[PDB]
Paper text:
Long cytosolic double-stranded RNA (dsRNA) is recognized by MDA5. MDA5 cooperatively assembles into helical filaments on uninterrupted RNA duplexes longer than a few hundred base pairs (bp). The helicase consists of two RecA-like domains, Hel1 and Hel2, and an insert domain, Hel2i, all of which form contacts with phosphate and ribose moieties of both RNA strands. The helicase and CTD, linked by a pair of α-helices referred to as the pincer domain, form a ring around the RNA.
The highest-resolution structure, with an overall resolution of 2.8 Å and local resolutions up to 2.7 Å, was obtained from ATP-bound filaments. The ATP-bound M854K MDA5-dsRNA filaments have essentially the same overall structure and helical symmetry as WT MDA5-dsRNA filaments with ATP bound. The Hel1 and Hel2 domains are in the semi-closed state (as defined previously) and the helical twist of 75˚ is low (as defined previously). With a helical rise of 44 Å, the asymmetric unit spans 14 bp of dsRNA with a protein–RNA interface area of 2168 Å2 similar to WT ATP-bound filaments. The M854K variant binds ATP in the same manner as WT MDA5, with a magnesium ion coordinating the β- and γ-phosphate groups. The most notable difference in the ATP-bound M854K structure is that the mutant Lys854 side chain forms a salt bridge with Glu813 in Hel2, and a hydrogen bond with Ser491 in Hel1, within the same MDA5 protomer. These polar bonds are more constrained in distance and orientation than the weak hydrophobic contacts formed by the Met854 sidechain in WT MDA5. We found that with ATP bound all M854K MDA5-dsRNA filament segments had a low helical twist (71˚–81˚). Hence, the polar contacts with the Ser491 and Glu813 side chains both contribute to inhibiting ATP hydrolysis by M854K MDA5, and contact with either of these side chains is sufficient to prevent ATP turnover.
Residue numbers in the entry: 307 to 645, 666 to 893, 896 to 949, 953 to 1020
Write the structure that this text describes.
RNA sequence: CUCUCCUCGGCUUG
RNA sequence: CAAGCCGAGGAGAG
């Protein structure tokens, strides 16, 4: 209900009706400022008998929910009507009625965007920006290129230009709401010189139509005393050992290569080799040549294994391979569980090649002689920190992959010194279904976060999920285990580490170029500060001139870009689908039907006798609903689906080859919307009757 | 510009 | 809780 001086100085120009940005360090009370400004605004508008409505825009669901239940509601509920929305609520069915019924709204941006689109073209009630008096935008550094924020603000700018034109013509001009942007750092984008940094800052200030940036400039000592920085630290590891396991893997890779007469220029264990193998597999699949597709797939797996070993334990790589080969065997035998049998020689060669050295690999992976230097350094760091504390320490470890989070959690649990010192660890990952690994659910995220808040969990092992938008208590140790993304993320993760006598550690090796990337980000930071300091002291007139120029340019460039998006012949029966591996006719483009313009199915009797059903592994670890579909050759095709009480198969296009009847330059597409032909809706007149 | 990794949102069938 | 659809951003390699 009250503010501190360094908050009030940045707040004032907004209390006067100017639209601005506010950059403040992580954890220094931006949300408080937002609430206070909201209250003052509403009161001040109520004095003069005017309409006052405030809308708050976020980009995450959890963030809306949390800010409503915890910050905005318990301070203004006593005077005003508050509501919060998202896609997880049912309140979204009538957004206008919500608009008129409540004063303060909290929401994700795409809701508003959809309503605006409805008004623009649809037949629905629709909403317009004029209906609001104040718009707050959290994490305003996302207002760029094609983000949803920027579409909204483009509408705003177009209205402003239209008002400028009306000013000399008929009056009055349409009124527009005040804008308030909050952030921690606007960043530098892709900048290589100071001038480009200035340019970027001005672009951000233009997209939001801001009067100033308004950073803290006076009470630096108080702020520094309140929020104190950690001590930055590097840790480097060097090795010239760990030979046997890696050498055996390399030998197997070479043996596989000499069986198909394919040697690339790139070396083993890099992204270049992975790219080469993917290209090779794609081409073989297109041509229909087996014995090259499969070898390429297996080579990709082995390269992944090497990459894994480079970062974590050997046994993780061993398991990566074991799982794959076990599954392949199970698929082949579930196939052969049916009724003379003809095998494939190359598949057998690969299977035997793995199973002949399995035991030797398992034996080599278990050897404390050569574990990993990075893991050793990490253990030392953790133990030092947690022993020095006397049970008063929390910590975060930022990793790159999901599998690495799981693996580090297991590695920590298998050793007893950690448990001795008071270490309780848990993993945290994202929720999207495109990452080789089954995601975590929002509910589980919430639970993990809560238990970290209370104290049941001491340290987290996370991907970039935890950089922004999560309510996390102050930590004593932040560690980056071979990860460097950008300057904004660096600022955020470093601001995690409050709780005085804290440190910020980066662990890595000597060969990679991670250290240099960190150093370059450190340079970019001071570039940014200098540019901001200049833009603050620019003369108002030229400032406005540049801002206007940039806005016009933005609108015009978007116009030109949209001109071309206007632009696919429909010939369903024309194409046929072939299996990648066992190239053979599977179906024609006339039997494929579409449910609700989303789900691609095939309901024909002769297709039911072409595939096999497996069980659901996600549910395996009861019942089985969406079981996987495989061909006889062992290639996956899709899954099972239920509609109107009927069981149906759903197909994934990335598993097939498309063959036309005109010229037959075969192709792959990776998703349905790229295939230029159309399909018909479902009809019960067919398939029976 | 391509490929991979990572994150987010809106929406359907059960 | 499972499956599917569409869009957006960031990093790296080539
Ligand atoms: N005026 C104030 N009076 C009392 N406490 C305050 C005030 N301002 C900030 N705080 C303290 O700061 C915390 C809230 O900070 P807040 O999380 O809003 O910072 P932030 O800028 O939102 O950081 P983040 O980037 O995590 O959102 C509260 O726990 C509260 O105790
Ligand atoms: Mg905040
Ligand atoms: Zn097949």
């Amino acid at each position: 209900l009250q503010l501190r001086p360094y908050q009030m100085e940045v707040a004032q120009p907004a209390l006067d009706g100017k639209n601005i940005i506010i950059c403040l360090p992580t954890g220094s009370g931006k949300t408080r400022v937002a609430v206070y400004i909201t209250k003052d605004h509403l009161d001040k508008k109520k004095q003069a008998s005017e309409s006052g409505k405030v809308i708050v825009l976020v980009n995450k669901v959890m963030l809306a929910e949390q800010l409503f239940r915890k910050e905005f509601n318990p301070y203004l509920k006593k005077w005003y009507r508050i509501i919060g929305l998202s896609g997880d609520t049912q309140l979204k069915i009538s957004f206008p009625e919500v608009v008129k019924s409540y004063d303060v709204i909290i929401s994700t941006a795409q809701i508003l965007e959809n309503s605006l689109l409805n008004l623009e073209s649809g037949d629905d009630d629709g909403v317009q920006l004029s209906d609001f008096s104040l718009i707050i935008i959290d994490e305003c550094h996302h207002t760029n290129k094609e983000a949803v924020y920027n579409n909204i603000m483009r509408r705003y700018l177009k209205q402003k230009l239209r008002n400028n034109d009306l000013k000399k013509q008929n009056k009055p001009a349409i009124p527009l709401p005040q804008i308030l942007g909050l952030t921690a750092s606007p960043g530098v984008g892709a900048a290589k010189k100071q001038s480009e940094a200035e340019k970027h800052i001005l672009n951000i200030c233009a997209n939001l139509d801001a009067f100033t940036i308004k950073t803290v400039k006076e009470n630096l000592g108080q702020l520094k005393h309140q929020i104190k920085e950690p001590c930055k630290k590097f840790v480097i590891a060097d090795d010239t050992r760990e030979n046997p396991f890696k050498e055996k893997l390399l030998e197997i890779m070479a043996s596989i290569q000499t069986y198909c007469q394919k040697s690339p220029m790139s070396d083993f264990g890099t992204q270049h080799y992975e790219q080469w193998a993917i290209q090779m597999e794609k081409k073989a699949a297109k041509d229909g040549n087996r014995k090259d597709r499969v070898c390429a797939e297996h080579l990709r797996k082995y390269n992944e294994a090497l990459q894994i070993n480079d970062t974590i334990r050997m046994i993780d790589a061993y398991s990566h391979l074991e799982t794959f080969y076990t599954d392949e065997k199970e698929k082949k035998f579930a196939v052969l569980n049916d009724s003379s049998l003809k095998l494939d020689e190359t598949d057998e060669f690969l299977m035997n090649l793995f199973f002949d050295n399995k035991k030797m690999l398992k034996k080599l992976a278990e050897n404390p002689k050569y574990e990993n230097e990075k893991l050793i350094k990490l253990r030392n760091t953790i133990l030092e920190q947690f022993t020095r504390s006397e049970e008063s320490s929390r910590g975060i470890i930022f990793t790159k992959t999901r599998q690495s989070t799981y693996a580090l959690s297991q590695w920590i649990m298998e050793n007893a010194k950690f448990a001795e010192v008071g270490v309780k660890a848990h993993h945290l990952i994202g929720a999207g279904h495109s990452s080789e690994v089954k995601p975590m659910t929002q509910t589980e995220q919430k639970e993990v976060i809560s238990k970290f808040r209370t104290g049941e969990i001491n340290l987290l092992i996370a991907t970039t999920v935890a950089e922004e938008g999560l309510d996390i208590k102050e930590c004593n140790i932040v560690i980056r285990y071979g990860l460097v993304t950008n300057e904004i993320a660096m600022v955020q993760a470093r601001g995690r580490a409050r709780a005085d006598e804290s440190t910020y550690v980066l662990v890595t090796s000597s060969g990679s170029g991670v250290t240099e990337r960190e150093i370059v980000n450190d340079f970019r930071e001071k570039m940014k500060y200098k540019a901001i300091n200049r833009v603050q002291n620019m003369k108002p007139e030229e400032y406005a001139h540049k801002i206007l120029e940039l806005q016009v340019q933005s609108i015009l460039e978007k116009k030109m870009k949209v001109k071309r998006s206007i632009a696919y012949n429909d010939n369903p029966s024309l194409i046929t689908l072939l299996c990648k591996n066992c190239s053979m006719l599977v179906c024609s483009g006339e039997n494929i039907h579409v449910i609700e313009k989303m789900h691609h199915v095939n309901m024909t009797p002769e297709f039911k006798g072409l595939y096999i059903v497996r069980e659901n592994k996600a549910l395996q670890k009861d019942y089985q609903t969406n079981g996987e579909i495989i061909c006889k050759c062992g290639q996956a095709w899709g899954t099972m689906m239920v509609h109107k009480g009927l069981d149906l198969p759903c197909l994934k296009i990335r598993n097939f080859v498309v063959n036309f009847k005109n010229n037959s330059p075969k192709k792959q597409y990776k998703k349905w919307v790229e295939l230029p032909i159309r399909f018909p809706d479902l009809d019960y007149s067919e398939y029976c009757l």
